[PDB]
């Protein structure tokens, strides 16, 4: 049997040498060119156990994106463990690109192709690939942006649904576009627009899938975050090099029993880091129109639990490993033996 194994996965991408955009620059020295001739081989009569919650691929990706950010996005000031560091904080061009992960000789990547795959247990339609599909390393909270959609229907995944402390990862089957803009010419005020009916229909379908999981006699409710750091209370993400903090109360105040949803956003200089515990300060926002149009392809939720009859779900996230998990869930690395 080819047992699961840890190896030196290398990265591949379509990064250009003439792009000063930071993902391109990093990939230029860290990655090889995208596989010109990919080969997926189906393994017949093979069943294989996967575990998306215990996957070294996620750990390796996490380290790479950390290195990417730590070389690319330099804050003017950084506070960690009581130690203060200051440096030149030049603004950069910032737009994530797809990164493929590939297995070196002696190893192979197995891929689960089952449509309703929950993340753990046996897979009956397994194939081997030389590289994963292209994954944009988007760092965000609450909403998963520019990821891959579920093929058939919405899928919800958790390491343990009955444990309310475990994050629930939602994978949509239809994207919901969200446009966030800091208009040209209050330099920190911004806003995010999305279709009201599309979001309401999305929450409606997520609730159905949650009822399947927790009980048909349950009343599903969405409420905003209970509190914490700004990065998790709001939908937070980097756009064009600027850190956005978007109030998502309207998105997550819903129960079963306008045209656009407009969320108020703020651009912040002082942020809590995701790479490590500490704070960082960047220079004020750039002038001109700052704008990103993204596909919402997933959500990160937490359940209140405790005591009864009703189940309240709130936007979650925080550990960026779950972001990487939302794309790497169908992969595992094995050694050829």
């Amino acid at each position: 049997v080819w047992k699961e194994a840890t190896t030196t996965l290398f990265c591949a991408s379509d990064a250009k040498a003439y792009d000063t955009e930071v993902h391109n620059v990093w990939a230029t020295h860290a990655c090889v060119p995208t596989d010109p001739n990919p080969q997926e081989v189906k393994l017949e009569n093979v069943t294989e156990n996967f575990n998306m919650w215990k996957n070294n691929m996620v750990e390796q990706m996490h380290e790479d994106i950390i290195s990417l950010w730590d070389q690319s996005l330099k804050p003017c000031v950084k506070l960690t463990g009581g130690s203060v560091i200051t440096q030149a904080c030049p603004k950069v061009s910032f737009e994530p690109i797809p990164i493929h992960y590939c297995a070196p000789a002696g190893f192979a990547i197995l891929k689960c192709n089952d449509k309703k795959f929950n993340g753990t247990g046996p897979c009956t339609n397994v194939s081997t690939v030389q590289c994963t599909h292209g994954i944009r390393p988007v760092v965000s909270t609450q909403l998963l942006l520019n990821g891959s959609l579920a093929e058939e229907e919405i899928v919800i995944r958790s390491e343990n649904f009955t444990n309310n402390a475990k994050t629930i990862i939602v994978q949509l089957n239809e994207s919901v576009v969200i446009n966030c803009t800091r208009p040209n010419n209050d330099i920190r005020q911004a806003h995010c627009n999305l279709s009201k009916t599309q979001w309401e229909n999305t929450l409606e379908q997520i609730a159905i899938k949650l009822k399947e999981q927790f009980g048909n006699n349950k009343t599903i409710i969405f409420n905003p975050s209970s509190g914490g750091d700004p990065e998790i209370v709001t939908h937070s993400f980097n756009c064009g090099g600027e850190f956005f903090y978007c109030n998502s109360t309207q998105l997550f105040t819903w129960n079963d029993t306008g045209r656009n949803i407009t969320l108020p956003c703020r651009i912040k200089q002082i942020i809590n880091m995701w790479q490590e515990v500490g704070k960082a300060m960047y220079a004020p926002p750039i002038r001109g129109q700052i704008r990103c149009s993204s596909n919402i392809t997933g959500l990160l939720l937490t359940r209140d639990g405790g005591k009864n009859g009703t189940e309240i779900f709130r936007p979650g996230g925080g550990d960026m490993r779950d972001n990487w998990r939302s794309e790497l869930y169908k992969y595992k690395v094995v050694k050829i033996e």
């Binding site: 209970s226 809590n272 790479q275 515990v277 550990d319």
Partner: peptide, 27 residues
């Protein structure tokens, strides 16, 4: 995550604190 500044913060909100990665989260 700093769980203690966190719990010390969340308890002032009527809630318990816990780590969400490198961030503070209230429950």
């Amino acid at each position: 995550x700093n769980l203690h500044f966190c719990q010390l913060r969340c308890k002032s909100l009527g809630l318990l604190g816990r780590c969400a990665x490198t961030y503070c989260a209230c429950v």
